[PDB]
Design a protein around this ligand. Sequence first.
Ligand SMILES: CC(=O)N[C@@H]1[C@@H](O)[C@H](O)[C@@H](CO)O[C@H]1O
Ligand SMILES: CC(=O)N[C@@H]1[C@@H](O)[C@H](O)[C@@H](CO)O[C@H]1O
Length: 241
Amino acid sequence: DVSFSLSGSSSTSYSKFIGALRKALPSNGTVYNITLLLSSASGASRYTLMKLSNYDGKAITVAIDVTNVYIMGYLVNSTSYFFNESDAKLASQYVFAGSTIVTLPYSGNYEKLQTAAGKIREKIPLGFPALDSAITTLFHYDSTAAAAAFLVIIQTTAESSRFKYIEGQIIMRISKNGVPSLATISLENEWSALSKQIQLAQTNNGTFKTPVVIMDAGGQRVEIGNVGSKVVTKNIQLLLN
Ligand SMILES: CC(=O)N[C@@H]1[C@@H](O)[C@H](O)[C@@H](CO)O[C@H]1O
Ligand SMILES: CC(=O)N[C@@H]1[C@@H](O)[C@H](O)[C@@H](CO)O[C@H]1O
């Protein structure tokens, strides 16, 4: 398993945690020196567990699908909570054995979580304090605030593992929460498209078959057309397969 403790945390310990999470995910090699995730996996081996503890030391354990870095659900005390989607129902057959299972009233999809939370990612502050609050919400399972808590946790763990830029954004917000940058949102939105295009580029002299539009540090549209881009060389850390 991997773990992150907010108590005693620093930029250094957070980066160690994100690095450990990246290292915990199996590969079928690399493409342009970027880890390629597995296309398929079986049973319990399809998951890695991530223990998260708040400032007060209260802990939850989150299950991640290694094929796509999607969060499946989590365990607190003797109760597990899984997203309402087939891949998470599958996960419930293999992890947190012996727990009492609760099916959440939403899938782990951003659109569904945002509808459930009554607010879009763009307006939800992120940072170490936001992570603390999110863990607390899930620890007590406040059903009215859980969707928002998942939105914070997903971005602070999975999205951060996928993009060095997002890891940096969380680090900027260690002391004071802030809503995600437009760049953060675009990278999250385009992860699967970037993953696809980078793999196609291998046999196309490094050129994407279809451009991918990201946003920069000022929200300006930037069209990514080849593997020379900084998004490919010094940002993306995991490719969907
Ligand atoms: C009752 C239950 O928890 N299982 C549901 C399953 O019925 C549904 O088909 C799927 C969405 O496709 O999501 C699962 O969580
Ligand atoms: C969802 C749930 O049952 N969470 C409970 C929490 O509310 C309670 O404060 C604690 C007591 O130690 O046990 C937790 O994990």
